[PDB]
Amino acid sequence: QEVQIPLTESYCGPCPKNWICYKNNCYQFFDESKNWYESQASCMSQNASLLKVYSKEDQDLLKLVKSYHWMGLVHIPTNGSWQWEDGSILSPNLLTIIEMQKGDCALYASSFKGYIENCSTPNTYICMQRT
Amino acid sequence: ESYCGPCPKNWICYKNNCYQFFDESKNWYESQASCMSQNASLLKVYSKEDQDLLKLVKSYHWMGLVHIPTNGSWQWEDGSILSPNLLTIIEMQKGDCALYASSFKGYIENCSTPNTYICMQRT
Amino acid sequence: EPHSLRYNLTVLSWDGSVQSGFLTEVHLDGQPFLRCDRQKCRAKNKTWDRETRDLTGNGKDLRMTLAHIKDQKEGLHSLQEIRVCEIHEDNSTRSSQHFYYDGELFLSQNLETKEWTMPQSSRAQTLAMNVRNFLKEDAMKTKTHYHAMRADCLQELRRYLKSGVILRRTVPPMVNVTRSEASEGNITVTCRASGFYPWNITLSWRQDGVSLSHDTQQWGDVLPDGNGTYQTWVATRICQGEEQRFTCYMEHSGNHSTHPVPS
């Protein structure tokens, strides 16, 4: 229950070949810089989607990620608020959003930060899939 | 494979190697103990291909690399010789332990300096 | 005055060996406001949450930077990263990053324009190369790292502002006029202004409503008067029975006041 022995070792749920698996989520980082739209397409091309942050606990490895990367966060002007691709509202206390450029997309950065960027700016991206 | 080689629950799995990062600053010795306490050991870098996501690690962290002084060269805890061309070793602080830093760097530190650490267990 | 936020990070070596320590001095509207070291952060309280994380980041990253300088000259050397951001009266922003080595500038980046700049000077240029090479190639910094640095700083400034720690409180001066007694049928008249913030004040004797030249007047410096206030004085020599011809004039923060000689 607490101890790490070879008996308590599980396989990490179904993930694309050569992806990161952590707490029944799969992740891959892409060094091929794309605008947000091309990035979204790339993630969906792999039956996946741009990174959603839903829990500091279950995605704590996001604390160690260097540089800035596209994630699935987008704006809505009528509501003056952010949400994910899947229409999910951003949990109010999860991300610190910083106003870096005028744009309707955000880059994930370490310490659960979201830096607002122009969607047309090419950038590295993170795909995530739920196991 | 759709499944990542057998790992502790709540550990990171990449190509059947298992990883965890620890924010609780410890000297090298206490860190090695901590990693072994969890059926692991401090990060060993053996392959730029199989550990390429070590390129995306922010800041510096204890790693399993030591300088046996009468050896006049670096090896891993387990006794394995460091592959040449894998790591760039930089002299930061006078010591016989190394911190991993991103784009496959090893920064030399005093072993008694408390620091974050990365545990790995090989498949 | 604009609003200043500044971070002053500092790392040390002893014969090429980067010491575990480091020290960040945070200045808010030009006043010391935080001192962090490796351990933790101390104002002058766990609202010092995000800054412990951030500034330990930079500290570590700056120990790494110093390890790539090849001075080797024996003994104690400092390296410094100073990030500054300002919010101007007019809503335009200012922001820069500076590196000092042994307390001398060798590299700047304007963060508004993203334009690096170095001293012309053999050592200054080799240093700058050492660190600009470490920044591009090893640390692998995108243009976006410098946009974030700029934005991180300002959101922080706006956050401190919002919290209401910064009071742009005017303290108007206390004024007093006095006179030095008869020597050869003449008097010195002294105007004194004290306990006033901000620092900027106009103080001048006038004859029949017209300022005296700076030359026929004698001037106090603007000295500190305690609690963050200031004091100063101006003086002139006049004839006995020309007293109500002279007055002391003062502007402080849109308050234009006039004090005659006690007759």
UniProtKB/Swiss-Prot annotation, chain A:
List residues of the C-type lectin domain.
14-129
Q: From the record, give the cysteines joined by S-S bonds.
A: 12-21, 15-26, 43-127, 105-119
Task: Give the misc comment.
Answer: Is not capable of signal transduction by itself, but operates through the adapter protein HCST. Some families of ligands for human and mouse KLRK1 receptors have been characterized being very similar in structure and highly likely to be orthologs. In humans, an additional distinct subfamily of ligands (MICA and MICB) differs structurally, having an extra MHC alpha 3-like domain.
What protein name is recorded for this chain? NKG2-D type II integral membrane protein
> Its membrane topology, per UniProt?
Single-pass type II membrane protein
User: What role does this protein play?
Assistant: Functions as an activating and costimulatory receptor involved in immunosurveillance upon binding to various cellular stress-inducible ligands displayed at the surface of autologous tumor cells and virus-infected cells. Provides both stimulatory and costimulatory innate immune responses on activated killer (NK) cells, leading to cytotoxic activity. Acts as a costimulatory receptor for T-cell receptor (TCR) in CD8(+) T-cell-mediated adaptive immune responses by amplifying T-cell activation. Stimulates perforin-mediated elimination of ligand-expressing tumor cells.
Major subcellular site: membrane
Q: What is the lineage of its organism?
A: Eukaryota, Metazoa, Chordata, Craniata, Vertebrata
Q: How does it assemble?
A: Homodimer; disulfide-linked. Heterohexamer composed of two subunits of KLRK1 and four subunits of HCST/DAP10. Interacts (via transmembrane domain) with HCST/DAP10 (via transmembrane domain); the interaction is required for KLRK1 NK cell surface and induces NK cell-mediated cytotoxicity. Does not interact with TYROBP. Interacts with CEACAM1; recruits PTPN6 that dephosphorylates VAV1.
Task: Give the UniProt subcellular location, in the record's own words.
Answer: Cell membrane
Q: What stretch of the whole protein does this chain cover?
A: 85 to 215 of 216
Q: Which residues lie on this side of the membrane: Extracellular?
A: 1-131
| Glycan-modified residues | 47, 79, 118
Q: Name one GO cellular component term.
A: plasma membrane
Swiss-Prot record, chain C:
Topology with regard to the membrane? Single-pass type I membrane protein
BP GO annotations: defense response to bacterium; defense response to virus; DNA damage response; gamma-delta T cell activation; immune response; immune response to tumor cell; killing of cells of another organism; natural killer cell mediated cytotoxicity
Q: What induces it?
A: By heat shock, by infection with human cytomegalovirus (HCMV), human adenovirus 5, M.tuberculosis and diarrheagenic E.coli, and by exposure to DNA damaging conditions such as high doses of ionizing radiation, chromatin-modifying treatments and inhibitors of DNA replication. The HCMV UL142 protein causes down-regulation of the full-length protein but not of the truncated MICA*008 allele.
Q: What is the effect of changing residue 257 to G?
A: In allele MICA*054
Question: PTM per UniProt?
Answer: N-glycosylated. Glycosylation is not essential for interaction with KLRK1/NKG2D but enhances complex formation.
Q: What is the effect of changing residue 140 to V?
A: In allele MICA*011 and allele MICA*034
Phenotype for residue 170 to R: In allele MICA*004, allele MICA*014, allele MICA*032 and allele MICA*044
Please tell me where this protein is predominantly located. membrane
Q: Residue ranges, Extracellular compartment? A: 1-263
In the UniProt annotation, what is the result of changing residue 114 to E?
In allele MICA*002, allele MICA*004, allele MICA*005, allele MICA*006, allele MICA*007, allele MICA*008, allele MICA*009, allele MICA*010, allele MICA*011, allele MICA*012, allele MICA*013, allele MICA*014, allele MICA*015, allele MICA*016, allele MICA*017, allele MICA*018, allele MICA*019, allele MICA*020, allele MICA*022, allele MICA*023, allele MICA*024, allele MICA*025, allele MICA*026, allele MICA*027, allele MICA*028, allele MICA*029, allele MICA*030, allele MICA*032, allele MICA*033, allele MICA*034, allele MICA*035, allele MICA*036, allele MICA*037, allele MICA*038, allele MICA*039, allele MICA*041, allele MICA*042, allele MICA*043, allele MICA*044, allele MICA*045, allele MICA*046, allele MICA*047, allele MICA*048, allele MICA*049, allele MICA*051, allele MICA*052, allele MICA*053, allele MICA*054, allele MICA*055 and allele MICA*056
Q: Where in the cell is it found?
A: Cell membrane; Cytoplasm
Q: Which GO terms describe its molecular function?
A: natural killer cell lectin-like receptor binding; receptor ligand activity
Tell me what happens on changing residue 204 to T: In allele MICA*004, allele MICA*006, allele MICA*008, allele MICA*009, allele MICA*010, allele MICA*016, allele MICA*019, allele MICA*022, allele MICA*024, allele MICA*027, allele MICA*033, allele MICA*034, allele MICA*035, allele MICA*037, allele MICA*038, allele MICA*039, allele MICA*042, allele MICA*044, allele MICA*048, allele MICA*049, allele MICA*053, allele MICA*054 and allele MICA*056
So which disease is it linked with? Anti-MICA antibodies and ligand shedding are involved in the progression of monoclonal gammopathy of undetermined significance (MGUS)to multiple myeloma.
Per its record, how is this protein called by name? MHC class I polypeptide-related sequence A
